[PDB]
Motif scaffolding. Sequence first.
Motif, PDB file in Angstrom:
ATOM      1  N   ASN A 189     120.718  43.231  17.677  1.00  0.00           N
ATOM      2  CA  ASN A 189     119.694  44.064  17.176  1.00  0.00           C
ATOM      3  C   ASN A 189     118.270  43.585  17.230  1.00  0.00           C
ATOM      4  O   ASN A 189     117.412  43.840  16.265  1.00  0.00           O
ATOM      5  CB  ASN A 189     120.023  44.873  15.762  1.00  0.00           C
ATOM      6  CG  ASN A 189     119.577  46.296  15.749  1.00  0.00           C
ATOM      7  OD1 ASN A 189     120.161  47.359  15.809  1.00  0.00           O
ATOM      8  ND2 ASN A 189     118.098  46.592  15.259  1.00  0.00           N
ATOM      9  N   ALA A 206     121.805  39.262   7.693  1.00  0.00           N
ATOM     10  CA  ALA A 206     122.754  40.435   7.546  1.00  0.00           C
ATOM     11  C   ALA A 206     121.752  41.547   7.174  1.00  0.00           C
ATOM     12  O   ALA A 206     121.262  41.480   6.015  1.00  0.00           O
ATOM     13  CB  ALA A 206     123.805  40.223   6.312  1.00  0.00           C
ATOM     14  N   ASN A 207     121.537  42.467   8.058  1.00  0.00           N
ATOM     15  CA  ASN A 207     120.990  43.626   8.008  1.00  0.00           C
ATOM     16  C   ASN A 207     119.323  43.327   7.377  1.00  0.00           C
ATOM     17  O   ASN A 207     118.975  43.995   6.346  1.00  0.00           O
ATOM     18  CB  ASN A 207     121.614  44.566   6.906  1.00  0.00           C
ATOM     19  CG  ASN A 207     123.030  44.922   7.164  1.00  0.00           C
ATOM     20  OD1 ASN A 207     123.626  43.990   6.699  1.00  0.00           O
ATOM     21  ND2 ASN A 207     123.420  45.890   8.110  1.00  0.00           N
ATOM     22  N   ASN A 240     115.239  45.825  11.917  1.00  0.00           N
ATOM     23  CA  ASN A 240     116.264  44.909  11.114  1.00  0.00           C
ATOM     24  C   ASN A 240     117.182  44.258  12.318  1.00  0.00           C
ATOM     25  O   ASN A 240     117.292  44.778  13.526  1.00  0.00           O
ATOM     26  CB  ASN A 240     117.168  45.760  10.363  1.00  0.00           C
ATOM     27  CG  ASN A 240     116.491  46.956   9.536  1.00  0.00           C
ATOM     28  OD1 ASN A 240     116.214  48.193   9.844  1.00  0.00           O
ATOM     29  ND2 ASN A 240     115.914  46.392   8.529  1.00  0.00           N
ATOM     30  N   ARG A 282     120.920  41.918  13.221  1.00  0.00           N
ATOM     31  CA  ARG A 282     122.433  41.808  12.753  1.00  0.00           C
ATOM     32  C   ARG A 282     122.791  40.223  12.605  1.00  0.00           C
ATOM     33  O   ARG A 282     121.974  39.288  12.789  1.00  0.00           O
ATOM     34  CB  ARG A 282     123.265  42.496  13.842  1.00  0.00           C
ATOM     35  CG  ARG A 282     124.389  43.603  13.303  1.00  0.00           C
ATOM     36  CD  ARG A 282     124.196  44.988  14.199  1.00  0.00           C
ATOM     37  NE  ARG A 282     125.128  44.896  15.114  1.00  0.00           N
ATOM     38  CZ  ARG A 282     126.330  45.436  14.821  1.00  0.00           C
ATOM     39  NH1 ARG A 282     126.452  46.007  13.440  1.00  0.00           N
ATOM     40  NH2 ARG A 282     127.446  45.684  15.465  1.00  0.00           N
ATOM     41  N   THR A 283     124.031  40.136  12.304  1.00  0.00           N
ATOM     42  CA  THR A 283     124.644  38.673  11.905  1.00  0.00           C
ATOM     43  C   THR A 283     126.149  38.644  12.164  1.00  0.00           C
ATOM     44  O   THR A 283     126.809  39.864  12.278  1.00  0.00           O
ATOM     45  CB  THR A 283     124.313  38.305  10.526  1.00  0.00           C
ATOM     46  OG1 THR A 283     124.764  39.565   9.662  1.00  0.00           O
ATOM     47  CG2 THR A 283     123.041  37.812  10.372  1.00  0.00           C
TER      48      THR A 283
END
Length: 101
Positions: free
Chosen positions: A34, A84-85, A92, A94-95
Amino acid sequence: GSQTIGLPPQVNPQAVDHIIRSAPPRVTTAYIGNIPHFATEADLIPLFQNFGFILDFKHYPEKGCCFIKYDTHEQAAVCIVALANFPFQGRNLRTGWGKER
């Protein structure tokens, strides 16, 4: 047992512990999805380095994902939960554990 506990001011090893359980202790790569097109390594590489160390960073703006390699696996677990978020330049990210896809 020997006194060995790490309680850093940022990021928690607890919620992160679950992350590792979803991957082998050998691999040590952080996958961030993202990501915007205006996200270069010059602004990303350092955004992750602060975590520990980056021996090789792979940014893929064409797909919107990057993979950062660290010295140890625990190093990725930290940034994993931290990213994370997490908000980034308004968007934002991602992970996860570096995976083919």
